[PDB]
Design a protein around this motif. Structure first.
Motif, PDB file in Angstrom:
ATOM      1  N   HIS A  37       0.847  -1.226   0.000  1.00 54.90           N
ATOM      2  CA  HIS A  37       0.000   0.000   0.000  1.00 54.90           C
ATOM      3  C   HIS A  37       0.876   1.268   0.000  1.00 54.90           C
ATOM      4  CE1 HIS A  37      -3.074   2.889   1.245  1.00 54.90           C
ATOM      5  NE2 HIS A  37      -4.006   1.947   1.112  1.00 54.90           N
ATOM      6  N   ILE A  42       4.695   5.388   2.716  1.00 53.33           N
ATOM      7  CA  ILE A  42       4.774   6.745   3.247  1.00 53.33           C
ATOM      8  C   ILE A  42       4.915   6.751   4.775  1.00 53.33           C
ATOM      9  CG2 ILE A  42       3.501   8.936   3.648  1.00 53.33           C
ATOM     10  CD1 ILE A  42       2.219   8.584   0.812  1.00 53.33           C
ATOM     11  N   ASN A  70       5.479  14.768   1.579  1.00 52.61           N
ATOM     12  CA  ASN A  70       5.023  14.556   0.217  1.00 52.61           C
ATOM     13  C   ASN A  70       5.765  13.393  -0.413  1.00 52.61           C
ATOM     14  OD1 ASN A  70       7.506  15.863  -1.280  1.00 52.61           O
ATOM     15  ND2 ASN A  70       6.791  17.493   0.104  1.00 52.61           N
ATOM     16  N   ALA A  71       5.136  12.774  -1.405  1.00 54.04           N
ATOM     17  CA  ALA A  71       5.587  11.483  -1.938  1.00 54.04           C
ATOM     18  C   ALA A  71       5.213  11.274  -3.417  1.00 54.04           C
ATOM     19  CB  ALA A  71       5.001  10.378  -1.112  1.00 54.04           C
ATOM     20  N   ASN A  72       6.136  10.690  -4.184  1.00 54.55           N
ATOM     21  CA  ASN A  72       5.885  10.129  -5.502  1.00 54.55           C
ATOM     22  C   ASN A  72       6.030   8.642  -5.401  1.00 54.55           C
ATOM     23  OD1 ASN A  72       6.810  12.993  -6.546  1.00 54.55           O
ATOM     24  ND2 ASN A  72       5.948  11.971  -8.355  1.00 54.55           N
ATOM     25  N   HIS A  73       5.016   7.945  -5.885  1.00 55.54           N
ATOM     26  CA  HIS A  73       5.028   6.500  -5.978  1.00 55.54           C
ATOM     27  C   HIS A  73       5.607   6.115  -7.348  1.00 55.54           C
ATOM     28  CE1 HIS A  73       2.944   6.198  -2.180  1.00 55.54           C
ATOM     29  NE2 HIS A  73       1.885   6.866  -2.613  1.00 55.54           N
TER      30      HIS A  73
ATOM     31  N   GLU B  46      -4.987   8.140   1.111  1.00 58.18           N
ATOM     32  CA  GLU B  46      -4.621   7.516  -0.152  1.00 58.18           C
ATOM     33  C   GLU B  46      -5.708   6.503  -0.548  1.00 58.18           C
ATOM     34  OE1 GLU B  46      -0.729   6.815  -1.093  1.00 58.18           O
ATOM     35  OE2 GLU B  46      -1.161   5.674  -2.953  1.00 58.18           O
ATOM     36  N   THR B  47      -6.156   5.736   0.442  1.00 54.58           N
ATOM     37  CA  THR B  47      -7.231   4.760   0.270  1.00 54.58           C
ATOM     38  C   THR B  47      -8.495   5.459  -0.222  1.00 54.58           C
ATOM     39  OG1 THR B  47      -6.324   3.407   2.037  1.00 54.58           O
ATOM     40  CG2 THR B  47      -8.640   3.003   1.402  1.00 54.58           C
ATOM     41  N   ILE B  63      -7.126   0.606 -14.136  1.00 60.74           N
ATOM     42  CA  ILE B  63      -6.836   0.589 -12.699  1.00 60.74           C
ATOM     43  C   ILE B  63      -6.423   2.017 -12.243  1.00 60.74           C
ATOM     44  CG2 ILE B  63      -4.424  -0.163 -13.083  1.00 60.74           C
ATOM     45  CD1 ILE B  63      -6.497  -1.443 -10.146  1.00 60.74           C
ATOM     46  N   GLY B  66      -1.995   5.520  -7.400  1.00 56.09           N
ATOM     47  CA  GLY B  66      -1.594   6.753  -6.723  1.00 56.09           C
ATOM     48  C   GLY B  66      -0.254   7.195  -7.283  1.00 56.09           C
ATOM     49  N   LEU B  67      -0.155   8.443  -7.712  1.00 49.43           N
ATOM     50  CA  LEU B  67       1.081   8.904  -8.342  1.00 49.43           C
ATOM     51  C   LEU B  67       1.837   9.809  -7.410  1.00 49.43           C
ATOM     52  CD1 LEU B  67       2.845   9.157 -10.948  1.00 49.43           C
ATOM     53  CD2 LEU B  67       1.179  10.848 -11.759  1.00 49.43           C
ATOM     54  N   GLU B  68       1.114  10.786  -6.874  1.00 48.28           N
ATOM     55  CA  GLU B  68       1.726  11.774  -6.000  1.00 48.28           C
ATOM     56  C   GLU B  68       0.784  12.052  -4.839  1.00 48.28           C
ATOM     57  OE1 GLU B  68       1.962  14.977  -5.041  1.00 48.28           O
ATOM     58  OE2 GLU B  68       4.132  14.961  -4.537  1.00 48.28           O
ATOM     59  N   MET B  69       1.312  12.274  -3.646  1.00 46.31           N
ATOM     60  CA  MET B  69       0.476  12.558  -2.465  1.00 46.31           C
ATOM     61  C   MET B  69       1.168  13.600  -1.640  1.00 46.31           C
ATOM     62  SD  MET B  69      -2.261  10.214  -2.444  1.00 46.31           S
ATOM     63  CE  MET B  69      -2.442   9.428  -4.056  1.00 46.31           C
ATOM     64  N   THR B  95      -5.450  11.488 -15.430  1.00 41.22           N
ATOM     65  CA  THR B  95      -5.184  11.727 -14.016  1.00 41.22           C
ATOM     66  C   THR B  95      -6.394  12.325 -13.343  1.00 41.22           C
ATOM     67  OG1 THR B  95      -4.344  14.003 -14.178  1.00 41.22           O
ATOM     68  CG2 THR B  95      -2.749  12.284 -14.499  1.00 41.22           C
ATOM     69  N   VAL B  97      -7.324  14.383  -9.698  1.00 41.76           N
ATOM     70  CA  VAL B  97      -6.729  15.118  -8.571  1.00 41.76           C
ATOM     71  C   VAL B  97      -7.773  15.271  -7.489  1.00 41.76           C
ATOM     72  CG1 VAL B  97      -5.638  17.290  -7.767  1.00 41.76           C
ATOM     73  CG2 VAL B  97      -5.150  16.380 -10.114  1.00 41.76           C
ATOM     74  N   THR B 116      -2.812  12.822  -6.289  1.00 44.23           N
ATOM     75  CA  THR B 116      -2.826  12.689  -7.739  1.00 44.23           C
ATOM     76  C   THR B 116      -2.799  11.220  -8.103  1.00 44.23           C
ATOM     77  OG1 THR B 116      -1.656  14.783  -8.033  1.00 44.23           O
ATOM     78  CG2 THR B 116      -1.692  13.286  -9.924  1.00 44.23           C
ATOM     79  N   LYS B 120      -4.564   3.968 -15.228  1.00 43.90           N
ATOM     80  CA  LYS B 120      -3.824   3.036 -16.086  1.00 43.90           C
ATOM     81  C   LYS B 120      -4.677   1.882 -16.572  1.00 43.90           C
ATOM     82  CE  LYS B 120       0.127   5.079 -14.989  1.00 43.90           C
ATOM     83  NZ  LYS B 120       1.003   5.761 -15.971  1.00 43.90           N
TER      84      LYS B 120
ATOM     85  N   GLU C  68       3.115  18.050 -11.693  1.00 44.32           N
ATOM     86  CA  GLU C  68       3.047  18.341 -10.264  1.00 44.32           C
ATOM     87  C   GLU C  68       4.386  18.912  -9.858  1.00 44.32           C
ATOM     88  OE1 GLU C  68       4.066  17.545  -7.065  1.00 44.32           O
ATOM     89  OE2 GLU C  68       2.355  18.124  -5.860  1.00 44.32           O
TER      90      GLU C  68
ATOM     91  N   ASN D  72      -0.631  21.257  -8.647  1.00 42.19           N
ATOM     92  CA  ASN D  72      -0.978  20.412  -9.781  1.00 42.19           C
ATOM     93  C   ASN D  72      -1.351  21.298 -10.909  1.00 42.19           C
ATOM     94  OD1 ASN D  72      -1.892  18.419  -7.423  1.00 42.19           O
ATOM     95  ND2 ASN D  72      -1.508  17.226  -9.276  1.00 42.19           N
ATOM     96  N   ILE D  74      -3.230  21.713 -14.388  1.00 43.12           N
ATOM     97  CA  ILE D  74      -4.386  21.014 -14.930  1.00 43.12           C
ATOM     98  C   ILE D  74      -4.580  21.468 -16.373  1.00 43.12           C
ATOM     99  CG2 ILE D  74      -6.888  20.499 -14.726  1.00 43.12           C
ATOM    100  CD1 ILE D  74      -5.179  19.734 -12.139  1.00 43.12           C
TER     101      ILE D  74
END
Lengths: 121, 121, 121, 121
Positions: A37, A42, A70-73, B46-47, B63, B66-69, B95, B97, B116, B120, C68, D72, D74
């Motif tokens: 997850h 994070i 902050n985070a990029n997956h 995120e969930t 699907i 999650g790209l960025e948080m 995307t 947001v 973000t 996919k 972003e 972000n 857009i």
């Protein structure tokens, strides 16, 4: 240990400005799809720079407090262990800024993160 | 379910562009100092926006990833439940947001986030 | 050149996965307080990754698009030149992720930044 | 003045917790491609939440200091004016958290942002 215990986190290495913590990718921390997850990743990161800032300050008269994360997956992890390396970027008197890179077993970046930690009385 | 079950998350309400999910603040999800771990609150968020994006697309074909948080930690939570309200800001073809606000029992903002989500195949 | 002209930006060095771009700290880019405007620094960083991603793709078929951007402002810049060093973190097919560090004359970190660039037709 | 002047920003509305500021889309602030440069848009937003925090504090004793900004992008802006609306999310003793939405002429979201402003003596 709380969450740290729930996620089976282990501190592999610590020195000033540096924290390396890892944890197993288990069903417990997967998304339903399921690969680890993004939130679990994070949470490991935030733990890493919380521990770091705590190691850099005077625990007796101060307390580190996560302010902004902050985070990029990037890639995914479905098994093995993931490892977070937190390295300090800025060691301000009031705030610390940390860089965190989280990798899987194949040395692939899973998550890249920055965290800002307020130092409070 | 996985992490969703580990954190005992439950959907209070869903409709197009809105998800409300909550979870109890237990020792299992606290930081060692005794308040809800910032990473657990972020996992909740995120969930929430992953479910929200899943609710907006054809999941036989696409699907949500999650790209960025990002997240600001504001007040803390020691007990009770926390509730994440994720409202969509931009529903793009590739995307999404999301705005996420997370509050404790006394309606205090614990965390505010933006997420973000990549769509996919 | 536009904004890049308005800001008198100039490319110190360029190579695959690396862009070093500098600009003078002038009254034109200052905040009403004494120092360089945080938003001007961030525009320097966004330009840096945009150029870098462009350098990494087929500019005759695809195009880089900022998606972003996030930034920590650490120190101030009062005069002289500031320099953004953008190094690539992940070079995906559809997204590039960049680390950007912006420094002043006195080797102080002014801004640390992470930028996500969509690659699109 | 300074960057505000350079960008021809106009304060359209102010009240506690709310700032509306606009600016023209000229070649001066364009990317080379070129629509409104993402960085210009971000500087507009950072300006809006800086003014809003200034309005909330005793500026004979304190100054607002941008700490963290995320954004972000857009839709793109080609001409006319763009308008930043900053609303406060959390007004703390030492830090303020702002939501900023930036729109073009055709009511399209150009940029969405969150700004963290430090209140410094």
């Amino acid at each position: 240990t709380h969450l740290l215990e729930t996620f089976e986190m282990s501190i592999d290495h610590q020195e000033d400005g540096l924290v390396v913590i890892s944890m197993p990718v288990t069903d417990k921390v997967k998304a339903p799809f399921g690969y680890l997850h993004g939130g679990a990743s994070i949470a490991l990161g935030e733990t890493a720079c919380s521990l770091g800032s705590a190691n850099l300050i005077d625990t007796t008269k101060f307390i580190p407090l996560g302010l902004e994360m902050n985070a990029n997956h990037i890639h995914s992890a479905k098994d093995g262990r993931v490892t977070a390396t937190a390295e300090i970027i800025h060691r301000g008197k009031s705030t610390h800024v940390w860089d965190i890179k989280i990798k899987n077993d194949k040395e692939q970046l899973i998550t890249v993160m920055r965290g800002t930690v307020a130092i409070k009385p």
